[PDB]
């Protein structure tokens, strides 16, 4: 039971409260134990506890005197117990409680007044009980209560009198989810002084009972309303009529299997700002279906439409100008849908749209022509996501309508083509382009000549072709900072591929075939493609088949901090190859063929490191191979994980399998 | 491989083997050709080729073998015609290849590309040097 300021006793098999703890302990966690009871005498020593989490135990009942020994108790958690009965004296002395959690206690009913005495209580949780009513008292108490959780009970109706005890309470959260409520008596929500949030998830209401509830919620202070999985199959223009008399800001209608939304179904919500409609079954979206929602800023439509059906091929249909009402919309999410395509006025009217996600939103979007995004011309779009749409071809001026765009994600598609460079015309403010995991991309001289402001370019797993053009395709990218070219099986690179890219910081080249370029027998000499990269910080050259490293390939990389060279075939390294790496913090050389670690090579590299990774190597445990290295290991602050297990000698056979760190250098 | 008394040719090349159980070849008395190249073999148990009294061709190229010792290769190297252990990281030390280099010095078995592809790997003093040029006068 480790404890310095908070005491935790989780899964300690404790049957009684330990009596050997610091006196000044304020938090005592006793969850998942076998505490049968909580006698006050065992808590006499602890007179300064603030939070006592005793849930998930076998407490059947408590005593009022327990709160006498804890005058400063604030949070009391009795989750998952069997306190089926409560008394008016049970919580009388606990006058400073803020949170009282009584979930899953098999409480059947509340008799007279178990919560009258406490006045500073903020949240009361009574979920997963057997309660059949909201009756918690007779007089008016719980003045400062803000959250009332009553989920997963047996409550079947709401009555005004049952809630009358909350006349002076401003309920910020009223959770009634998973209770089969079938009747909302008039004035039931007007009993609460101020109700700000109501949750009715997993409560089978239906359109008619929804209309009754909305009429019952009128002229209240409600701001958040959640009706997820409420069996709301259809909506009409009279469904939320009562909500005309409130200032609702958030509405949740997800998982309702909603099929048809009538025109002006939400015209009663002029102040709505957050709308959630994910995971529904909408067949057709009409022009006036979203009419009257001009204050909405966030709309979620993920998985909101009917899926592909092989019986009738009834793809969901979105009428044109169906979003023209959303003048203040800024964030639109439409992922995981089966929309056939993008029409000429799909997004017309969205004059404040800044984020649009269309990841996996379409079934047949193969070609991105110059008319695809014309409806987004007047939107100030900054981020566009188009992943997983099986896009195959991008034509010229495809994104010419997006002049303010900064992030464009086109990965996880089937784009196989040659980048002529005309696809990026009009992208005057672009910063990031993601193209990883496509069919094949072939570069040319002017592939990126039209986007000089680019800063991040990801080209992983695209089977890059012609990256070795005599004028480098990356030459115009003077502001480029992150470049990813991994897993492309690239074999040939010219020495001026990265010339002029003084701002480059991250370069990923792992899982290519660049081994031949660094061999001294390569015709014309080794290729020095890392020159001039003064600001480079992260270099990844893992799994390229390298056998040898030219001595002067890292000479210009003064600010380099992380270099990864594992999974290569490196055995012998030239001396003074890491001389200029004066700021190196992480070196990775695992799963190579390295046998000796010597000062003339690794001296400057091992100067001030944080992490070292040279695990699966055939170390030759000899006084001229690892003596300096093992002495360095003996005294060093660099973190070397799995040092005692995966750093094993290979030769001589006397040392085969022995740990490198246990090599004895006393006779060197 | 048990019970195969009349087996003559065995090919186990490129199976990813790391270790060989000591008693896998015990019943193969008439075995003449065994191919174990392109595996990941480094350490072999002693007396693993004891019963191969008629072995004529042994192939162990492109493995991870570092030491060739009498307790393993003694009976195997008795009367051979061909030996193939070319691309291996030989540890040129007096306890790793001294018996092997002495055996190479006087033997009638044909060892092609002995002077070029049998190169030391460790210690770094010997890295790249031919195995056959190892000096055992100070062993
Ligand atoms: C007391 O400790 C328990 C166990 O660590 C906390 O209960 C849950 O523990 C699981 C497993 O670590 C977490 O996944 C949950 O998130 C924890 N519950 C919550 C609500 O976060 C318990 O919360 C701790 N109690 C206090 C007062 O810190
Ligand atoms: C575009 O949307 C996709 C899908 O929602 C995002 O992909 C997720 O990215 C996060 C963070 O990288 C990962 O943890 C998830 O696993 C990804 N999901 C899938 C299905 O791959 C992607 O990040 C978005 N792109 C941008 C630029 O926001
Ligand atoms: C608390 O409720 C009582 C009874 O309705 C009322 O008289 C009193 O003014 C309320 N307190 C406040 C601060 O409104
Ligand atoms: C809300 O109050 C207004 C103004 O008093 C009233 O006209 C309307 O009928 C009320 N709504 C309901 C559902 O009673
Ligand atoms: C209302 O909903 C929004 C969005 O889900 C949330 O951020 C906010 O906290 C909610 N209001 C209250 C009072 O909890
Ligand atoms: C709802 O729409 C119908 C169909 O046009 C219309 O007759 C009715 O008046 C509308 N309801 C309200 C409350 O306006
Ligand atoms: C109203 O809805 C019906 C069917 O839901 C649709 O045919 C009609 O066009 C809609 N009204 C307008 C003005 O679009
Ligand atoms: C799109 O390209 C076609 C073919 O070049 C051209 O005829 C058409 O005018 C272009 N569209 C726009 C809006 O420029
Ligand atoms: C590159 O960044 C610098 C500094 O922010 C800026 O002056 C320059 O305009 C940028 N280049 C382009 C083409 O946006």
Numbering used by the authors:
A (entry chain C): 29 to 696
B (entry chain D): 558 to 696
Task: Give sentences copied directly from the paper behind this entry.
Toll-like Receptor 3 (TLR3) plays a key role in anti-viral defenses by inducing a potent immune response against double-stranded RNAs (dsRNAs) produced by viral infection. Previous crystallographic studies show that RNA ligand binds to the extracellular domains of TLR3 and induces the formation of a homodimer of TLR326. The charge interaction with the phosphate backbone of the RNA double helix plays the principal role in the interaction. The ligand-binding site involves both the N and C-terminal parts of the TLR3 ectodomain.
To determine the structure of the TLR3-dsRNA complex, we mixed purified full-length TLR3 with a poly(I:C) dsRNA. The length of the poly(I:C) used in the experiments ranged from 200 bp to 1,500 bp, with an average length of ~400 bp. The raw micrographs showed that a vast majority of TLRs are linearly assembled along the RNA strands with regular spacing. The final reconstituted three-dimensional structure shows a 2.8 Å resolution image of the TLR3 tetramers on the RNA strands. The cryo-EM map resolution was estimated to be 2.8 Å, but the RNA region between the TLR3 dimeric units has structural flexibility that prohibited refinement to a higher resolution. However, when the refinement was focused on the dimeric area of the cluster, a 2.3 Å resolution could be achieved. In the structure, the RNA double helix is bent by ~8 degrees at the junction between the two TLR3 dimeric units. Our cryo-EM structure of TLR3 is practically identical to the reported crystal structure with a Cα root mean square deviation (r.m.s.d.) of 0.77 Å. This result demonstrates that linear clustering does not disturb the structure of the dimeric unit of the TLR3-dsRNA complex. The dimeric units of TLR3 are repeated 2~20 times with a regular spacing of 103 Å or 34 RNA base pairs in the cluster.
